[PDB]
Design a protein around this ligand. Structure first.
Ligand code: CAC
Ligand code: CA
Ligand code: CA
Ligand code: MG
Ligand code: MN
Length: 770
């Protein structure tokens, strides 16, 4: 794997240390303490956090007199260091909050025993080590924070003892970081952030500069390769949150101790979580991941002066605050832990210290749909409403593969709608990384909503290069994007030679922002077998021929609902019912029906119509009108007829009421059988019932609402060159102006068409008179 050629980010590696240690300083100074003691009374959230912290069993439990041996279970050794680190931090905190003598004595005894026992006899390169770098990252931050909080009350003797213990763990992490983490995944970044905290705690130690520098260098190798600049984390949502356990404390520590503020440079990793949230605030079960909440409330306070494309006026802080509190937390009841570190972490304390009760929750007010083309995730989203069954969400996954925690999911999608998880990613595993079923099923192409060619998954053209996106369009009535992947490209494990050369171009559309069309073009230099898989998540599958229905019940993930799907072309494909595991969280795996549609072909097409429905909704009437060169059909839903057409080439062809040379076309009628909305990919003409709607002198991609005879409105996808576009006016109606991107463009009217030269895409209004 090339760790240097992904478009990630990095920060300065210059170690910045204050002139003299101050304790406390990691989270707050001496002067802050009484405000932090009083913080419990601000709102119901601070009150709940205070009730949890002040009743922690770590305040009352016997400090264990039994030190484990190197030959005890990895579980017991892990829990020993976890428990001792938690005794230190909880007791140190409650001493600052209350002044109770017992809390200082307990914090002091735990710190004097920090990293006693067999830890330095053990080998963290042994898989499942009880002292793995991922756990001691949390232990280091827990013990360092306890020391920061108790240091002013220690005897000179106890200070020297406890410093020597913290300094030894810092030296051992510094010396072994790159041996323990020879690949720059979360096993490198987490203990790097731990080392950072230790260096900032012991800023007067002679080696603190060396420690902090290596910490920053090591963390940068992770943020350069596993993160995109746009904030996407390539190990998935679960290992993102796992990383945040050490990253979020380190960011505050470095700002608070040295004045180095990295919150601006890390901003995108938090905005990313809000961009990909489903209607209940869950990050997707993509790569080795479960559904996750994103703890954006713990950094909201740092973004009060940061602009976001998620709101016309509000700052990022208010959107980060909105996102966390508009999450369904029931999948983490009754315990409440979503960090992945529930033996080690002090999440209640860290929340109590980071949460800002003065930040108003403001729902994003922009278009739901977002294109993150640098990483390659797109979300089609009707609205930002929380737990509303009228919402529709589709994630379109097209991320360059990383060499850790990877699933074969190129050009796959998941749907969240009617308050239920529908079209599915199969998830991480049954329980864990090491299960055989993860390799034989969960990571495999067939476990995803993809098309394989002779069983080969769609993949990257080259290592660390995002699959190309095109024809991005966002309107009130129709959204669109296509993504391109190859069959004979780059993957993990590495495969250099193929018996053929081929590619998939997948277009997704969002008709009426109400349902989905998935339109595939497939090109190969040879006859191959194309297998299309459609997984309906945790639903009962019914249906025959090209039609499948998945029926959901009230479960841990959503409400009773159903998802109806049709596949074209009916007459050129066979439909195979299969069964596969779908899992959203550790331990909750079950088997459900999925569809395998199959063609043997060289160049061909598929189309899916996928409709979220409430429990008792009518099934739409869907008719396949596919022929030799043309794939598509009609959908009659809620008394309106939509038409979808795809072809491989720019040739004049017809399907239902559409005639076009476009490689994709969408039309929507009203109740009254009048054309209301249309879109084309690379058309020079469209007729509807034999009436010309538009012509152009060169291929153009756009979407237009013609429902308002005083103003046609839509968007034109990005343009390579100048196109002369001619749109038919309502009969007998003049044009008054044409606006593209807030600017008048020159127009003429010829034979009842508005004629414009367009040199750039964007939003278009054609304003008519009477
Ligand atoms: C699957 As075919 C190219 O025979 O329509
Ligand atoms: Ca993947
Ligand atoms: Ca839209
Ligand atoms: Mg390791
Ligand atoms: Mn997967």
């Amino acid at each position: 794997a090339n760790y240097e050629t992904y478009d990630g980010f990095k920060v300065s590696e210059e170690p910045v240390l204050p002139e003299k240690e101050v304790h406390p300083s990691l989270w707050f100074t001496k002067s802050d303490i009484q405000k932090i003691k009083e913080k419990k009374n601000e709102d119901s959230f601070t009150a709940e956090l205070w009730e949890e912290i002040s009743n922690s069993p770590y305040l009352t439990m016997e400090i264990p007199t039994d030190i484990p041996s190197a030959t005890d279970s990895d579980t017991d050794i892990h829990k020993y260091y976890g428990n001792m680190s938690r005794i230190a931090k909880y007791n140190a905190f409650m001493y600052l909050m209350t002044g109770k003598s017992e809390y200082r004595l307990r914090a002091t005894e735990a710190l004097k025993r920090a990293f006693d026992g067999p830890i330095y006899e053990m080998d963290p390169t042994v898989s499942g080590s009880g002292v793995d770098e991922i756990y001691r990252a949390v232990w280091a931050q827990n013990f360092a924070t306890a020391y920061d909080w108790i240091q002013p009350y220690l005897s000179d003797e106890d200070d020297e003892i406890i410093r020597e213990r913290l300094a030894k763990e810092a030296q051992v992490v510094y010396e072994n970081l790159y041996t323990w983490g020879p690949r720059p995944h979360n096993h490198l970044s987490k203990p790097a952030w731990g080392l950072g905290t230790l260096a900032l705690t012991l800023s007067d130690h002679p080696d603190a500069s060396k420690w902090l520098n290596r910490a920053l260098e090591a963390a940068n190798t992770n943020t350069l390769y596993f993160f995109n600049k746009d904030g996407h984390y390539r190990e998935g949502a679960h290992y993102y949150v796992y990383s945040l356990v050490n990253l979020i404390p380190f960011l505050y520590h470095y700002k608070n101790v040295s004045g180095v503020n990295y919150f601006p440079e890390y901003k995108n990793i938090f905005e990313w979580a809000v961009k990909i949230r489903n209607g209940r605030g869950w990050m997707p079960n993509v790569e080795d991941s479960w559904i996750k909440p994103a703890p954006t409330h713990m950094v909201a306070s740092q973004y009060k002066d940061t602009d976001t494309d998620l709101h016309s006026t509000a700052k990022l802080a208010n959107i980060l605050q909105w996102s966390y509190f508009n999450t369904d937390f029931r999948p983490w009841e009754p315990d409440g832990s979503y960090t992945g570190a529930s033996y080690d972490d002090t999440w209640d304390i860290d929340q109590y210290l980071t949460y800002d009760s003065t930040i108003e929750q403001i729902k994003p007010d922009v278009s739901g749909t977002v294109f993150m083309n640098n990483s390659g995730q797109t979300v089609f989203r009707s609205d930002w409403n929380f737990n509303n069954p009228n919402s529709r969400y589709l994630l379109f996954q097209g991320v360059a593969e990383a060499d850790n925690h990877y699933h074969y999911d190129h050009l796959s999608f998941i749907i969240h709608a009617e308050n239920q998880m529908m079209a599915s990613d199969s998830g991480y595993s049954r329980n864990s990384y090491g299960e055989g079923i993860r390799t034989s099923w969960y990571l495999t192409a067939e476990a995803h909503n993809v098309i394989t060619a002779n069983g080969e998954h769609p993949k990257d053209v080259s290592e660390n290069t995002t699959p190309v996106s095109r024809y991005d369009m966002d309107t009130d009535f129709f959204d669109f994007q296509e993504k391109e992947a190859v069959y004979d490209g780059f993957t993990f494990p590495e495969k250099n030679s193929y018996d053929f050369s081929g590619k998939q171009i997948r277009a997704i559309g969002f008709p009426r922002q109400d349902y989905f069309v998935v339109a595939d073009q497939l090109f190969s230099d040879k006859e191959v077998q194309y297998d299309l898989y459609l997984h309906g998540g945790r639903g009962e599958m019914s249906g025959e021929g090209n039609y499948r229905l998945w029926t959901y019940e009230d479960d841990r993930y959503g409400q009773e609902a159903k998802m109806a799907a049709w596949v074209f072309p009916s007459k050129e494909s066979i439909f195979i019912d299969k069964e596969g595991e779908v899992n959203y969280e550790a331990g909750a795996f079950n088997s459900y029906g999925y569809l395998n549609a199959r063609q043997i072909a060289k160049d061909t097409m598929f189309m899916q119509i996928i409709v979220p429905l409430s429990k008792y909704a009518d099934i739409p009437e869907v008719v396949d009108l596919s022929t030799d060169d043309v794939v598509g059909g009609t959908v009659v839903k809620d008394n309106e007829k939509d038409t979808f057409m795809q072809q491989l080439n720019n040739a004049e062809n017809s399907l239902g009421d559409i005639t076009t040379d476009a490689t994709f076309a969408y039309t929507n009628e009203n109740s009254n059988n009048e054309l209301q909305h249309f879109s084309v990919r690379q058309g020079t003409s469209l007729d509807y019932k034999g009436e010309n709607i538009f012509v152009s002198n060169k291929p153009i991609t756009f979407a237009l609402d013609i429902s308002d005879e005083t103003q046609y409105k839509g968007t034109i996808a990005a343009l390579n060159e100048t196109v002369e576009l001619r749109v038919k006016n309502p009969v007998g109606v003049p044009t008054e102006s044409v606006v593209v991107n807030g600017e008048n463009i020159e127009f003429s009217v010829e034979d009842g068409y508005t004629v414009i030269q367009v040199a750039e895409g964007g939003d278009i209004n054609i304003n008519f008179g009477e």
